[PDB]
């Protein structure tokens, strides 16, 4: 297979990792998604201790005690599955840590937690954290930062993807260190829409288009599938794949990127 690297980002809550595995090309091929993203672990607010941490619902809990048969199928296809962490409404963000050492432990958290669950990579999404909420503080220059950096040292050979989104996204840099190097890829939130990530990082490493099977019209999907291709962009991202019959979805973005057909089962 040759062309973008293909995301697909799955609400575990409601949906399975494993339908990301049951889509190749037609052709000789291979998988039509690249990276599998778990659908969302969470930065809450202990208020008491004034300390932030890695939150999992127990339905993301489950599909990580679970990760032999939720996870482990998917990565054995050759796909990459990464942890997707979302703001909670608890005034605690990724740009919103005091300190070094703060934001140092929230990065083992996450580290610890792709080791543990044998998993690929972290996905930051700055979005409802609420910043101000329980006495926290507004975005600040140093904190996102200060993550970025803690996570990358912890964790050198795993991908860290940002979800252009929020205060972080726009806090890259702080210090003598600019964190958007330490990115593996940065994407376009918005379903259906096309905007091309601010952040620093070569076209190959940047998706942005954004669509979302089952939401984006199928005119749409490729031809932001077709104008990545054209503009010289390396990733594609689908949001939110279900257990539905989606293979003529998926077939509209193939097509463009890689020159084929989808099939699935």
Known sequence: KQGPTSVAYVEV????????????????????????????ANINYDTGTKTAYLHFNENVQRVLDNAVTQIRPLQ??????????????????????????????FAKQLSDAVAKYGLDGVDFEDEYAEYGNNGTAQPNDSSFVHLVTAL???????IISLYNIGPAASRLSYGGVDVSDKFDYAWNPYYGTWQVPGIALPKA?????????????????????????????????????????????????????????????
Not at 14 to 22: A, C, D, E, T, W
Not at 25 to 34: E, K, Q, Y
């Open 13 to 40: 809550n409601n949906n399975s990792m494993l339908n990301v595995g049951k889509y190749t090309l037609a052709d000789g091929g291979g998988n039509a998604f690249d990276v599998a993203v778990i659908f969302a």
């Open 76 to 105: 054995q296809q050759g796909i990459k599955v990464l942890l997707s962490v979302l703001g909670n409404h608890q005034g605690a963000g990724f740009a919103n840590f005091p300190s070094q050492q703060a934001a140092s432990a």
């Open 152 to 158: 990358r040292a912890n964790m050198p050979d795993k």
């Open 205 to 265: 490493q940047l998706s942005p288009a954004a669509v979302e099977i089952g939401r984006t019209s199928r005119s749409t999907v490729a031809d932001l599938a077709r104008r990545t291709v054209d503009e010289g962009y390396g990733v594609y991202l689908t949001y939110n794949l279900d257990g539905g019959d989606r293979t003529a979805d998926v077939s509209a973005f193939t097509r463009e990127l890689y020159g084929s057909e989808a099939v699935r089962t």
